[PDB]
Amino acid sequence: TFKVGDTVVYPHHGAALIEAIETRQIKGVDKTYLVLKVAQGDLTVRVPADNAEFVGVRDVVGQDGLDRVFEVLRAPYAEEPTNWSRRYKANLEKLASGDVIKVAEVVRDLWRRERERGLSAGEKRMLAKARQILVSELALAENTNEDKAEALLDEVLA
């Protein structure tokens, strides 16, 4: 399932590359740890392969992902509750869910809201974080350059 040198998407950190497989022993049990890293925060993540699906790791989605996130990005008739508190409570939950379709919907609706009137400066931090993690997810999926990854999305979100 998991090999060396491959790219894996980790929640709240985006795409990452695996360095090696670690065989550290805990209580006399040889767990199959794997170590991975990103270029954003300069951190190393060690996850055993047995509970990898439980913690929420996920591989690189092929050609079946960009088309579905584009068609849910272009999906009209999206509505939000009138009170901003319910939508505010929903969006970070959708971000923490880690689904690509959910984060694409959140960034599309939020970008539309910022375009129409302009929300605030506080929400700019989370829009920026979501755009960063989404462009990092799509950058290593299509194997494109990061500047090309952020450039290609500029003509499709309108």
Partner DNA sequence: TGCGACGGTCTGACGCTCTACACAGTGCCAGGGGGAGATAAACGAACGCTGAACGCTCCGG
- Interface positions with DNA (CB under 7 A): 84-85, 119-123
Q: Which is nearer to DNA, 64 or 116 (CB)?
A: 116
Please report how close the Cβ of residue 138 comes to DNA at its closest, in angstroms.
Answer: 28
Round to whole Å and give the CA distance between 53 and 99.
14
- Are the CB atoms for 8 and 60 separated by under 8 Å? yes
Give the pair of three-digit tokens for residue 142. Answer: 């299509």
Q: Which is nearer to DNA, 59 or 88 (CB)?
A: 88
Q: Which is nearer to DNA, 120 or 143 (CB)?
A: 120
Please report how close the Cβ of residue 84 comes to DNA at its closest, in angstroms.
Answer: 5
